[PDB]
Design a protein around this ligand. Structure first.
Ligand SMILES: CC(C)(COP(=O)(O)OP(=O)(O)OC[C@H]1O[C@@H](n2cnc3c(N)ncnc32)[C@H](O)[C@@H]1OP(=O)(O)O)[C@@H](O)C(=O)NCCC(=O)NCCS
Ligand SMILES: COP(=O)(O)OC[C@H]1O[C@@H](n2cnc3c(N)ncnc32)[C@H](O)[C@@H]1O
Length: 631
């Protein structure tokens, strides 16, 4: 009956009464009334609103002159212009100064019962002397630094040592292949790379040093490669280029000055798959990104200094950037660096970790939940008394999963916060406010401060006003943590995000606003599919399949999946007869595993004789492929 069909007979659930009774502190807003009043000031007077929020949350060396200049259509937005600051001062120094022995990082190793806790003073030392290593090898303010690290505290050391000297960290997910590492290191023109000898994830060795050596053969501008001894296994060593982390840091002082950065100096690049082309180097600058990180960490996740915050995402992706690293450290609480998987050594792992370290907020993807919900409710017998916020990212936590998350995991004592955002937005843009906003299962609820969502007619591009509407999801106004460009290709940035509907920011997502104003994300309207919370281009995989000598044309599409959410399925037509078609589905799968990485391997590759991508999506020579699907 309603135009937003996902919103038929879905009421709001209030924040549970237990949330306030057991809360160790006072929440940051007095209620929905204060959200609405702050939200309206953030739309009608962002200059006043964001100036106060930034001076509340971020310590500037030099105060800023003006909250914002530029427009969406101009592609010239700058926030807190005239300000100077350093992101690692804000994540480390100011907290070490006040409370040197407060724990900043809880590292949880691949094996239980290992790991360690790291104080803000220890973090300041490790950031400083790693920054010393890079400066000593020639890394300067404004250079990019490639980072190919797993989930160990050393990764936080590396991002923040980069920020400390004004280098621009460019993190590459440790599940990427050599080709993908190479592409990103070249496009970013990094001359320094930081990696491990090997990874350990779920009991499994990841030959990270061997991958780096292969990529580096095609990166002749990389002149130093700093290697952290994670396992101590014999790895290949290239003298005059490779350096041991532990040998070099021991040479240098335990303190280094922080470099004074402009508000709009680049902070990092994060290569991101999109609808067309190779991955884009999404660039975030410094003050606005950090303001958005801290403001969502504070208001969305109810972070207080004493909290122990646990994001489950990998540092290789934007959730790891913003909520494993920047948001919790800016706010001065403790952050958990989880090296393992939710299934190692067993399916109780997430809750082993949450009970041992008394985690207050946990932040995960629905893929992980579905993998766990199928494992059974018996892997979950933990008190976890301090756990009051349950975050979800990447896709709608649907009703069955949202119930299992609320009752079995949270014991109806925690608030579930379905945060909608994307790499380009820097931090949450549509999300309930932890402990404040009444929620609906499967809805991202309401916009964050400074976010002005509109629903657009997909064809005419016009604004569809009022409630119970559906169409393209766009934002009407700029916001502090928006991405500022695509590295080396601002026109692509304009063409992708700002020239599609001039005057608006184009999210790439379809959405609907229900009778109450709550938003329901329908997913991508372009050829980006979300597999296991990993953001993938169907074009990228098609490009990888064509890299096989037998493939002529290739086509990849995304069909709904009960565990992976969406399952990538590939089709390929061969140039010549393959007498071993069974052997070919192995080499085509390995090809994608080599061009991108294991995590992008298609489920099955179909071979047919003979682009209307929509027909393949609805099916999973038109009658011949329907028989082909049946096999
Ligand atoms: C749920 C999850 C833990 C499953 O882990 P998994 O057991 O490795 O299974 P996956 O399907 O994801 O990965 C398949 C392949 O990717 C590889 N892979 C995944 N993560 C990797 C990593 N961090 N490093 C190296 N390789 C990785 C696996 O080893 C595997 O390779 P293989 O086929 O040779 O064995 C993982 O997919 C995940 O983290 N999803 C969440 C994404 C997200 O939204 N995070 C934000 C959370 S706030
Ligand atoms: C993590 O940011 P990424 O850039 O990896 O993801 C970018 C892409 O994820 C999707 N998405 C993220 N959160 C939600 C969410 N709560 N609900 C629904 N869909 C979501 C969306 O399609 C976005 O365009």
């Amino acid at each position: 009956l309603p135009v937003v069909v996902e919103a038929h007979q879905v009421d709001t659930f209030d924040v549970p009464g237990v949330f306030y009774e057991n809360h160790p502190h006072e929440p940051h807003l007095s209620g929905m009334n204060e959200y609405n009043q702050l939200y309206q000031q953030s739309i009608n007077d962002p200059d006043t609103f964001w100036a106060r929020m930034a001076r509340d949350l971020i310590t500037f060396e030099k105060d800023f002159d003006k909250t914002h200049i530029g427009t969406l259509e101009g592609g010239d937005n700058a926030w807190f212009v005239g300000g100077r600051l350093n992101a690692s001062f804000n994540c480390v120094d100011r907290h070490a100064m006040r409370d040197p022995n407060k724990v900043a990082i809880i590292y949880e190793a691949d094996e239980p019962g290992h790991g360690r806790s790291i104080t803000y003073a220890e973090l300041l030392k490790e950031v400083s002397r790693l920054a010393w290593v890079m400066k000593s090898q020639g890394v300067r303010k404004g250079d990019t630094v490639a980072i190919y690290l797993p989930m160990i505290p050393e990764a936080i050391f590396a991002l923040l040592a980069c920020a400390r000297i004004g280098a621009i960290h460019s993190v590459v997910f440790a599940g990427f292949s050599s080709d993908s590492l190479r592409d990103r290191t070249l496009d970013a023109r990094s001359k320094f790379i930081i990696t491990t000898d090997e990874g350990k994830r779920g009991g499994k060795v990841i030959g990270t040093k061997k991958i780096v050596d292969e990529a580096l053969k095609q990166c002749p501008d990389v002149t130093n490669c700093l290697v952290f001894k994670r396992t101590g296994a014999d790895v290949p060593w290239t003298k005059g280029r490779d350096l041991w982390w532990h040998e070099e840091v021991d040479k240098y002082p335990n303190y280094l000055p922080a470099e004074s950065m402009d508000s709009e100096d680049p902070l990092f690049l994060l290569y991101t798959s999109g609808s067309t082309g190779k991955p884009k180097g999404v660039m975030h600058t410094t003050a606005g990104y950090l303001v958005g990180a801290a403001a969502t960490g504070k208001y969305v996740f109810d972070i207080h200094p004493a909290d122990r915050f646990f994001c489950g995402g990998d540092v290789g992706w934007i959730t790891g950037h913003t909520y494993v690293v920047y948001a919790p450290l800016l706010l001065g609480c403790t952050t958990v660096v989880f090296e393992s998987t939710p299934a190692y050594p067993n399916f109780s792992r997430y809750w082993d970790v949450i009970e041992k370290h008394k985690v207050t907020q946990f932040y995960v993807a629905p893929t992980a939940l579905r993998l766990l919900k199928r494992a059974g409710d018996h892997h979950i017998n933990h008190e976890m008394k301090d756990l009051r916020i349950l975050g979800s990212v990447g896709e709608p936590i649907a009703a069955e999963v949202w119930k299992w998350y609320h009752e079995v995991v949270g014991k109806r004592q925690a608030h579930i916060v379905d945060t909608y955002w994307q790499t380009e937005t820097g931090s949450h843009v549509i999300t309930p406010l932890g402990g404040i906003t009444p929620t609906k299962p499967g809805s991202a609820s309401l916009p964050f401060f400074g976010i002005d969502p509109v629903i657009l007619d997909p064809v005419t591009g016009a604004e569809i006003p009022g409630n119970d509407v559906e169409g393209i999801l766009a934002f009407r106004k700029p916001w502090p943590s928006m991405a500022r460009t695509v590295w080396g290709d601002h026109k692509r940035y304009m063409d992708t995000y700002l020239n599609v509907y001039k005057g608006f920011y184009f999210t790439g997502d379809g959405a609907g606003r229900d009778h109450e104003g709550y938003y329901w994300i329908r997913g991508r309207v372009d050829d980006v599919v979300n597999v296991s919370g990993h953001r993938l281009s169907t074009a990228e995989i098609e490009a990888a399949l064509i890299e096989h000598h037998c493939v002529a044309e290739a086509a990849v599409v995304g069909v709904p999946d009960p565990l992976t959410g969406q399952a990538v399925h590939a089709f390929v037509a061969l140039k010549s007869g393959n007498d071993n078609r069974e052997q070919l589905q192995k080499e085509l799968i390995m090809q994608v595993r080599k061009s991108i990485g294991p995590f992008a391997a298609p489920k099955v590759v179909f071979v047919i004789d003979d682009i209307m991508r929509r027909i393949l999506r609805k099916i999973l020579i038109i009658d011949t492929f329907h028989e082909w699907k049946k096999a």
